[PDB]
Symmetry: D2
Subunit: 245 residues, 4 copies
């Protein structure tokens, strides 16, 4: 393939569709987790060749991650950029929590990015080139009122990224993390009660920047670690949360 | 309710456990100890401490084990002023040679154990509107750790859990703080690292910024700043204890 | 109406590259001391250029105010503002002097203070704007051989975090980035990396085993300046091949 | 012989309580500007006292050197050394001045620089010693209403971490601790917390919902100074009821 190839692990939700659009704008070919037919059509009109991978977007197994990485090599014979997000918010006071909740949040927030990096890193170290962005959470960077177990496991995910980054830095492969809070997408609006307009104003009051962030603006930020234009930073965590972190 | 303050040391079988118990006895505490030797019980009794041994719960492998240690304190003394634990085993190896089952195993050791300890002890202390908890995590949690990427990752979860619990319960007067070591002189570290060989040991000491290994005795004295009741206005702290390595 | 960027200094380091990225993104430019070659290049890229001479060191409240006032006079607006300052000071703490601490404070803290003191009020008035203060990766960690430089760079980064938190409600973003091990003349001199033997020793100790380029650093900086991403403030990101 | 502790200032804040903790721990004392009442009290606890007059602001290298020389002259050793410095400066960044930035730098950074520049070389030649620089919890995070203060406190903490890393191979430890929300007169005055309702509003900002005492803070500081613990250096610990 003459064009660079990006893997977006999940295009069903959150920033996934917008990441694919940014990559198509940057002249990438794409391997996408479970893209809608419409998203595939849109990206193809932007001049991007698209290879959908179905059923492995939860990265719930080493096999799921390997299938996504293998799809890039099978289709295009290269993999230049790879990005994933995972996990669901778990809320409730520590003193009312259970060991089972901690185990469940660990799976989505740590096993998933573990599996992704275990599959993708060897592909890129072999090429002595590549950019990996692991989207964790801003909740990993600070104590998070009402989400103590969630915050704890997100911190492990971010530190895993920093550890992997340091281990492979000499190969030229970059591994970075970003993490959000107070973003405007369905799963958050439902969990936060933001869907009511009056409630959304209350949620905004918590945010220093007094608003929710967009998938569009977050996807543009993510390109700083994925579009190939900037290659001399690794092991970073950046919060994307309106100044909350 | 007993007049002397009571400390729980979750495990006196290894590492800093015996030394923590000695420091507490010197500070006029009574003690609940995980799996103490008869030698250690006799030593602390000679120092004027009442000792309640708890057998077989020191791995904190379930909520029930953490609850058994907390309940031993309330049964014997009707109070629990200070509580400290350490857990986990170093796991090393390149990230690309690691397994998901290793990640799960280090999570159990490094995060489930302190989760179980805090889940049992915090409610006891918040009811009393007082108490000091020290969770010994690891210095490897505070920075990327060459050769131990998974271990470092899960240690960081444990330290961030402490900070979250601390912030949640701070208004109750209960303090929850963490400390983490590297390069300490105890058998499990010496066995790992290859320290038992002197040449490996001397080379290892060469790499530490302070150019030596730490002692259990000096580390136990440090830990008292978060446990002996003399200082009560900090919570949610992590302090490294690793000869300047972190 | 095209957005307006201020690049405080286009004489050295990433300044000329920042101006080029901004021109590529459809910005008009207020620049500190641009060369006629750079002005010609940026004008050929279709950008209107307002040169400001003599204030590129930001050594006074007046210098920073002059650059901000220039934007308002030419364009009536200021959408993005970026600065770098300071000189590497090296040597063991035990051999250092209070005068060296005072000098490195002026370059590394007074200059960004002056820049934000002038630019922030302009942007908070319009309830919009992006500020990037380039501090140093030395501010994020102990820096062997540059202890005083490291200390004052930490102040600059923490000032940015303080200003960011103060003005977040206005929508103005204030972020910091900081380099080490960058391929520019000034750095090679301070590191003695001009000698290839020292150079290889310098590349070693850099996890990505190389020096960074002005071009790739300028691209990274656009994430805080090009208007495409507006929902983060008070960040510090290191740009140092993994060293921080 | 007895270990020797330098407490740079016993006039205010935690100074007198640090002197009391050191005397309890069996130290002889070199003290900045102690009252005769405090000298007598510490004498009664079995400590030998060397008062140093007029050097407690650490306003020059010479004043820090005078304190260090007082220890060696009297006792021929200096095992532990602790200082605090600086005064709160409050106000919005956009209403601040460069002069305010310069003044807070002197108190919060030049003072600890001067202390370490004198004390470190004394201890490194003895291949032992414990230094505690009290900076501020405001150095560890954005501090609403004190942006300039927060920024310079961050420099002081980072200077400590840099000095620690440079001298760690000598066995000398250099650590920092930083408070907020402590019950002492200067804070009650600045805060208006002499009024109980003002004090309740201040305490509401503190996770632990109270102010800290000089006595309990002095006990904490002994972990870095009393000689019982010697295997950590380059740490910053906040002492601010969970606020940092």
């Amino acid at each position: 393939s003459n064009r660079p190839v990006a893997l977006v692990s999940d295009t069903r939700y959150y920033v996934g569709p917008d990441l694919a659009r940014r990559f198509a704008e940057k002249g990438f070919d794409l391997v996408l987790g479970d893209p809608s037919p419409n998203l595939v059509s849109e990206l193809e009109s932007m001049g991007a060749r698209i290879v959908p991978v179905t059923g492995h977007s939860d990265l719930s197994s080493p096999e799921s991650a390997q299938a996504q990485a293998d799809a890039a090599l099978s289709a295009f014979g290269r993999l230049d950029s790879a990005v994933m997000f995972s996990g669901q918010i778990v809320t409730g006071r520590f003193v009312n929590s259970t060991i089972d909740q901690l185990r469940q949040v660990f799976v989505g927030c740590v096993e998933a990015p573990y599996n992704f990096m275990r599959a993708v890193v060897p592909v890129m170290t072999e090429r002595e080139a590549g950019q990996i962005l692991i989207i964790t959470s801003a909740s990993g960077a600070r104590p998070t009122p009402g989400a103590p177990l969630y915050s704890s496991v997100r911190a492990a995910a971010t530190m895993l990224v920093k550890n992997v980054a340091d281990e492979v830095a000499r190969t030229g492969v970059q591994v970075n993390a970003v993490g959000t809070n107070f973003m405007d997408f369905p799963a958050f609006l439902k969990a936060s009660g933001a869907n009511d307009p009056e409630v959304r104003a209350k949620i905004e009051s918590q945010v220093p920047m007094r608003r929710l962030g967009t998938m569009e603006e977050f996807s543009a930020f993510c390109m700083a670690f994925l579009d190939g234009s900037s290659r001399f930073t690794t092991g970073q965590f950046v919060a994307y949360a309106g100044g909350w972190a």
